[PDB]
From Swiss-Prot:
Span of the entire protein shown here: 1 to 90 of 130
Disulfide bonds: none
Post-translational modification as stated in the protein's UniProt record: Phosphorylated by protein kinase C and calcium-calmodulin-dependent protein kinase. These phosphorylation events are modulated by neurotransmitters or hormones.
Tissues of expression: Ubiquitously expressed. Most abundant in tissues such as heart, brain, muscle and adipose tissue which utilize glucose as an energy source. Lower expression in glucose-producing tissues. Higher levels of expression are found in tissues from individuals with type 2 diabetes than in controls.
Protein name: Astrocytic phosphoprotein PEA-15
Gene Ontology annotations of biological process type: apoptotic process; MAPK cascade; negative regulation of D-glucose import; negative regulation of extrinsic apoptotic signaling pathway via death domain receptors; positive regulation of extrinsic apoptotic signaling pathway via death domain receptors
Organism: Homo sapiens
NADP found in the keyword field: no
Amino acid sequence: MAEYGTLLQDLTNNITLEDLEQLKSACKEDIPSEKSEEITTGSAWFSFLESHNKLDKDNLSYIEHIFEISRRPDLLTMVVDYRTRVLKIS
């Protein structure tokens, strides 16, 4: 659980204001436009993905897809690498 939140913060730091707009566009169908106006940070965008039951805490294949279609292998890698590390932890 803490690892999930931690990842979101690590991702947020690697998201620019322009990328945020692109990410909001990527999830324009998942997050209501009224709620996309409430987004000021990457962490806000992430919090709506949780609030709207779009990104699972354990299943991060959703956000990996979003980063794929957003053309950010870097952000995708952050999730894949981190998630793998968490899976290794036992």
